[PDB]
Amino acid sequence: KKCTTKEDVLEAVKERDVKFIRTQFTDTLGIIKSWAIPAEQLEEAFENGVMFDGSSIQSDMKLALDPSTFRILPWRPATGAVARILGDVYLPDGNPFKGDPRYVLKTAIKEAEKMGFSMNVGPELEFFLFKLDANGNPTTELTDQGGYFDFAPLDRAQDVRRDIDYALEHMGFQIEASHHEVAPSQHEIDFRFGDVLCTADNVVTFKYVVKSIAYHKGYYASFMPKPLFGVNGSGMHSNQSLFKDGKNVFYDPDTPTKLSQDAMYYIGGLLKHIREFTAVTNPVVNSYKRLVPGYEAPVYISWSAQNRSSLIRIPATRGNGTRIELRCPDPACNPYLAFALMLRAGLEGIKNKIDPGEPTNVNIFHLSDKEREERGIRSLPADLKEAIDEMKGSKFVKEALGEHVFSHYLCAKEMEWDEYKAVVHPWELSRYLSML
Amino acid sequence: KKCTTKEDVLEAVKERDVKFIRTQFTDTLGIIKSWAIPAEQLEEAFENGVMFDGSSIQSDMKLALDPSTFRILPWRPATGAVARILGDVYLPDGNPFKGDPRYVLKTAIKEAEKMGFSMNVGPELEFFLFKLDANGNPTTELTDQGGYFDFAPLDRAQDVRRDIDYALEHMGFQIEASHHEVAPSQHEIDFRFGDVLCTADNVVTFKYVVKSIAYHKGYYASFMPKPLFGVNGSGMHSNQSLFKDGKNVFYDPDTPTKLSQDAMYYIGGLLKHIREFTAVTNPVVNSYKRLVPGYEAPVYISWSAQNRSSLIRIPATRGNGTRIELRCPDPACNPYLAFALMLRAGLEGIKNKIDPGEPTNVNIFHLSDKEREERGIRSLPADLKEAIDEMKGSKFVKEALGEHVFSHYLCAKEMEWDEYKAVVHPWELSRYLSML
Amino acid sequence: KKCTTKEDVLEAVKERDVKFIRTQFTDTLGIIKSWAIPAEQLEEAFENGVMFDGSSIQSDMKLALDPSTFRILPWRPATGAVARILGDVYLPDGNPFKGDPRYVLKTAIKEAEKMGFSMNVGPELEFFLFKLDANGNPTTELTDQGGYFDFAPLDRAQDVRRDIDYALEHMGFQIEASHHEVAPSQHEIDFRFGDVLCTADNVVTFKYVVKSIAYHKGYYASFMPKPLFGVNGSGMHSNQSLFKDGKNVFYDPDTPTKLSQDAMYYIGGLLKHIREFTAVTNPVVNSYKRLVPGYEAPVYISWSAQNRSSLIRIPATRGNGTRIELRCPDPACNPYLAFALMLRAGLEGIKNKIDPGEPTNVNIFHLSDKEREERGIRSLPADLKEAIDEMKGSKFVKEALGEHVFSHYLCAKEMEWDEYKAVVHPWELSRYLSML
């Protein structure tokens, strides 16, 4: 069932014999942070909250648990049941901490509600399933050579996949559909189209649930945006819709395309502002190894209805199911920041009535540079450094994320890029050692 | 029992505790495609259908499930039962998608009904049973050195074979007979007569059921037309019969051969048109390593009653069991397209009163080229490129398969052949490195 | 249940079928010492005590068991339950032995009680979790690459950590929180406040309980202050508070910082005297490998409220939760001696009204040597030899610990340092063999 009050949580813990409670939160960079609490401490934690270190996020912070987020993890140790819970971070003086990505998403939700809109997001997460070495360390050994939508694997990896699906279903995730992806040993899982906050929490839970199941079954699940060269990467498309007064606002039966003017303004705002938070949507270096021409990943800023290579795709579904799909993000991104920025950009586009321009129904990759210049088609940042440079001068991103998160994210990404740029890769040795 | 209405399917799911439903369909090239659906979503899927990407077949189409095709897979995971289901593909505007091979077969059946006939097909499927390496990858290691109809194997591979047979029987396949084949580790399974659509669906299910059982028992089942050199290949003979008014059309007690004129016209049409869709019946490059003189595989276009090596053979059975066996296809072919083209060619031959000519009762291989030229005995295409060239100019094949499937199949096969033709094989190194 | 009298202990042993009783005590250097006693001998031991060798501590002594310290160890051998017990050491003439660290702590507690104060300590213990080799010997291979507060590990090491936590809760430790630490494979566990004697006994039990669990699950738990170079070390921070008449002495609502003058004098005394027993707080050579600039370990004598890099930190909590945290000690230290010296230093500071000086709210590591000289920021011993030299001339430490313990500890540490200083390390060979 659904737990609402802390009394319900206590009753569930006593009834099902939950021995340990794990908090759950994410830092600025998207890493999942957690710590364990004994079951007896739960009542005191509900009464007064738990003190902890804010340096894990960014220095003493108080966490106030949220009973509505209580859920039981889908494994049963012989000791007892295990459950997780979320909450809000407060400063010692009582003010909420503005460095929490969840707080950023909540502020974005409040800004949206100020105009009466609410967002529902259904993401599509893709991941790989590799083998483990003799020492249990992760590797890149493939498990099958299947293709798109193939009925594979059929060995024990099939049992592992079925176990993952059943574990996800056991928590009430309400999975839409799961299938093989284009690359070998690549799988995709579609989430139910639902509220944005619950969706972000479900994604965060999903990542480590899948990783733990993969370990316990003897395999490895990876979320790298591009773990292998020559095959498709892993992306996280974000279907979204806005609802006012319980009705979808993107649907307009009186228009030839069955789309309202608000949807046009939303698309225009997203197209205008996507360059600035491309760094947020693609937070690691590998993400830009994924974003290269010649695959399903989009590298040009355009929107279309029938075309699939466009950055923003509008599915043929209409009515209450009308949605807009953004194909840039990858699973390595922080869901809270990405969703908050996407919502804020869409709202700014709607408010300012930004025209999205004509759609691109042709294959952009087949066009020439002169054609792209004539049509005025821009491209996403080529590497992480360019994305950081674009983000630095963006006042909109700074306003949306706040000073603290903006500065910390920029510093961390800058240090990571500086560390990366000075390495000598074996490819350079292979190409240059004998030639020079 | 047999499920006919969605209420029966729901009742069976609730009764036997089925947790996952897997759709089933095949692309143009014959690869089996599928995706999973949670049991709770089944009612909504029945009510409205499921959206999915049509790029797997050939871009968004809706699948409408068919309750009559519901069946439970013959393995019991500890989590719960697993079942599969089939359906029809519809475009968003509501029109059926013409690129589905199942739709092609349905159109062929509709044409046969227009002329008042129905076809029953019982195929003979042959496959190999190899060993897996230490890493679980497929190999070509033999399991026994038995011969034709031998009582082999007798080790644990015998238990694996018996398990395969029992699993097939548990699904209601109603197998006729199963025996060892001529080549070592080669086995054959025969099907009963039934409706052609049901037979194609059964074959499609058969392939992955056998492969899954082979993995789970530690072996590998291969359907390559010719996996080893110097031994017989694997073929899929197709016994067929036309039924009108509940009685066999082919049987005619008044003729000396006990065959009706309609059977003669059917054979004539098949002989006339087989060369054009030989590419469809033999889709991969390896299929033509099997169509070489010196084995049971036929390479000359002829029909006979007593000769066992002819392309078209008439078994001595008469009455309702009267049938025509075509010995060209191999298990790698797409059953839907092959059966549709075969039925259409036979129907055209019946319509046009095509005379099949005199049967060949001698050994064609033992004859000379001058004798074959004198008798006008044509031969099947020697390589995939020749088959593609023959198929490209065939108006009848394009008319039967439709423009979309025709073009996509030709493009895929052309790309595959172009990739293959530029490879340097180790045989060339072994033969020419020292000599030149 | 809380056991008070020996009759309760005997009844519990009979009821729960405890077959073996293990004594528990520590030597001067902090090693845990124990020996086994059959269950039938327990009544005679309670009546008359147990004779044993005092050379293990420092030669015939008598141990008088304390029934209030009876606990049952958290594992269940098939033979029967196992329990541990503590007691006081007496000379044959009946006088208590002054060489027992527990007696030193008891004398410190009595000295505090002379002024009506009582102390509560909650320590934060950090440890590593390595893999065992093929022969079951401790090694230093990491189990995960997690970071601060990361939700790691997710393989069987997760089960090992959960088992450790469950055993600790089962014994009645009342753990506050347990989480991953900054360094890979490093974990931290926090205790609740309690009387200092019980806390020290709990820590001593905790060490070997965790080690035994780690062995029995196939891993190794290490308490080395710095097992790896380039990563954070393991420390044991000590949160302490003084209570008078059931109220917290430190908390003063009237002062702007909400700290009483007594707390200021306590901090002043600690800052004055920390240099002289730094050797006791850091007993081994490796501890001074941990104490290097550039990590969380403090190397300068200072106190701060907001800066968290100081030697003494004041958490933002107030009221009865007011506490003072000292960050120099490491898990290798002897808890009894460390706590006794902390209490003695604090009480001496309170008696003499020592002013703690102005707090340091800036980053000390970023200042220059001239700056720190102007500020008068003194430093901790760089190596064990310097710490021994400082401790030798300390009258306060000698009078606090007694002549016997002082002399024995100095001799042991001097011998260890003399043995260490004459070794030739492989780093010297790597740097100097080729160069010279």
Swiss-Prot record, chains A, B, C:
Its EC number is 6.3.1.2. Residues 16-94 form the GS beta-grasp domain. L-glutamate binds at residues 232-233, 290, 296, 308, 327. One of its GO terms (cellular component) is cytoplasm. Residues 101-436 form the GS catalytic domain. Binds 2 Mg(2+) ions per subunit. SMART domains: Gln-synt_C. Mg(2+) 1 binds at residues 124, 237, 325. GO terms for biological process: glutamine biosynthetic process. Its cofactor is Mg(2+). It is an enzyme of class 6 (ligase). Mg(2+) 2 binds at residues 126, 181, 188. It catalyses: L-glutamate + NH4(+) + ATP = L-glutamine + ADP + phosphate + H(+). The keyword 4Fe-4S does not apply. InterPro entries: Gln_synt_N, Gln_synt_N_sf, Gln_synth/guanido_kin_cat_dom, Gln_synth_cat_dom, Gln_synth_gly_rich_site, Gln_synth_I, Gln_synth_N_conserv_site. ATP binds at residues 176, 241, 308, 313. It is found in: Cytoplasm. One of its GO terms (molecular function) is ATP binding. Directly stimulated by the effector molecule 2-oxoglutarate. Inhibited by GlnK1. 2-oxoglutarate antagonizes the inhibitory effects of GlnK1, but does not prevent GlnK1/GlnA1 complex formation. It holds the Pfam family Gln-synt_N. Homohexamer. Interacts and forms stable complexes with the regulatory protein GlnK1. PANTHER family: GAMMA-GLUTAMYLPUTRESCINE SYNTHETASE, TYPE-1 GLUTAMINE SYNTHETASE 2. Belongs to the glutamine synthetase family. Probably involved in nitrogen metabolism via ammonium assimilation. Catalyzes the ATP-dependent biosynthesis of glutamine from glutamate and ammonia. This is Glutamine synthetase. It comes from Methanosarcina mazei (strain ATCC BAA-159 / DSM 3647 / Goe1 / Go1 / JCM 11833 / OCM 88) (Methanosarcina frisia). The gene is glnA1.
